[PDB]
C-alpha cells in the first residue's frame, strides 16, 4: 500500500493552474510577524484519485521587511502519504502599498487510502531581516476523507 | 492647517519601517494601517497612513466604505480608495487589495485616537462595524520614520 500509494504519487506534477479550489474555507496554519500560511483545499483533478487531497498552500506577508529563503515542509502518518511540489518562489517583499500584494504557492498532495482522519505536522523556515526563524506546528482542520472526491 | 487642499498621491508614498497596525480583522477581512512620512515638506505635522484592505474570504466583499473621525483638535481626510470591492480569494492567481490614503493633521501633537466606521457586504450579509485605533507613533517622531 505504501508502495502502491508511493507508486501512485511518484513523478506526477499537478500544475497550479489545473486546480479548482473548493469553497471549503481556508485554514490559517501559521500567522506570526505579519507572515501567514494558508491551506485551501481542492479535489484531485486527475481521475481515479478520490482518495487524494490537494492542498494549495498560500504564503503572504504584510511585514515591513522582506522575507527570504522560505521553506514549508510537512509530515504525515504512515497510513497515508504526502508529497510537496516545489514552491512558486522562496521570498516575499516588504509590504508596498503602491502595488498589489504578493504570494508564494505550493501544491501539496495527500494520499489517504484507508480514509483515516488527517493530522499534519509542519515545519516552516524563514528569514526576516536578520534572524532566521524555525517554526513548527500542527494542523488537523482537514476536510473529511469521504468528501475528497466531491470538493 | 486644513487638509482641504492637501493630497498625497499613492505613488509618492514611501513605506516606513514601523510595524503596521491591524485595525479590523473578521470574516477573513483585514484592514491594516501602514504609516509613512509626509513627502510634501509643508510641515512636520501631518501623518500619512496607507489603509490596506485584504480578503481571504471565499466570496467577494462589495460596497466597502472605510470612514474615520478624529477629535476636533485634529483633522482627518481620506482620499478616494482604489476600489470598493475585493474578489473572493483565489490561490491560483496573485492576491488583491484595496488601498486608501489617510491623512492626519495634529499640530498640538497630542495622542492620536481615531474612530472608524467600516461598512461592507458579503453576499446578502451586511456589516456595520465601528472601532478605535490609538496605536499611532508618537507625533514627536512624525518627521523621521
Describe this structure in words.
The structure is a homodimer. Chain A is mainly β and 151 residues long. In chain A, 5% of the residues lie in helices and 42% in strands. Chain A is built from one helix and eight strands. Chain A has one helix at residues 2-9, and strands at residues 27-32, 35-43, 52-61, 67-75, 81-84, 104-111, 120-128, 131-139. In chain A, a hairpin with an 8-residue loop joins strand 2 (35-43) and strand 3 (52-61). The first copy, chain A, is elongated. The first copy, chain A, starts with a helix and ends in a 12-residue tail after the last strand. At the A-B interface, strand 3 of A face strand 3 of B. It is classed as signaling protein, membrane protein. The entry lists the keywords clathrin-adaptor, GGA, appendage, beta-sandwich, signaling protein.
**Terminal CA distance of chain A:** 24 Å
Q: Using the coordinates above, name the CATH class of chain A.
A: Mainly Beta
Reading the helices and strands of chain A in chain order gives HEEEEEEEE
| Structural class designation of chain A | mainly beta
Q: Helix segment count of chain A?
A: 1
Spatial ordering of strands, largest sheet of chain A: 1-2-3-6-5
| Largest interface chains and counts | A-B, 27 and 26 residues
Specify the CATH architecture of chain A. Sandwich
Strand count of chain A: 8
Count structural domains of chain A. Answer: 1
Estimate percent helicity of chain A: under 10%
Radius of gyration of chain A over all CA atoms, rounded: 16 Å
* Largest sheet, strands/sense/barrel of chain A: 5 strands, antiparallel
PDB class: signaling protein, membrane protein
Keywords: clathrin-adaptor, GGA, appendage, beta-sandwich, signaling protein, membrane protein
Assembly: dimeric
Entry title: Crystal structure of ADP-ribosylation factor binding protein GGA1
Amino acid at each position: 500500500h505504501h508502495h502502491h500509494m508511493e507508486l501512485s504519487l511518484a513523478s506526477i506534477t499537478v500544475p497550479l493552474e489545473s486546480i479548482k479550489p473548493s469553497n471549503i474555507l481556508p485554514v490559517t496554519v501559521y500567522d506570526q510577524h505579519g507572515f501567514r500560511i494558508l491551506f485551501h483545499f481542492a479535489r484531485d483533478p486527475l481521475p481515479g484519485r478520490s482518495d487524494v487531497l490537494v492542498v494549495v498552500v498560500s504564503m503572504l506577508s504584510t511585514a515591513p521587511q522582506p522575507i527570504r529563503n522560505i521553506v514549508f515542509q510537512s509530515a504525515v502518518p504512515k497510513v497515508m502519504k504526502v508529497k510537496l511540489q516545489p514552491p512558486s518562489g522562496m521570498e516575499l517583499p516588504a509590504f508596498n502599498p503602491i502595488v498589489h500584494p504578493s504570494a508564494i504557492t505550493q501544491v501539496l498532495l495527500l494520499a489517504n487510502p484507508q480514509k483515516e482522519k488527517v493530522r499534519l505536522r509542519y515545519k516552516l523556515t524563514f528569514t526576516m531581516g536578520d534572524q532566521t526563524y524555525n517554526e513548527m506546528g500542527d494542523v488537523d482542520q482537514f476536510p473529511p476523507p469521504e468528501t475528497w472526491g466531491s470538493l
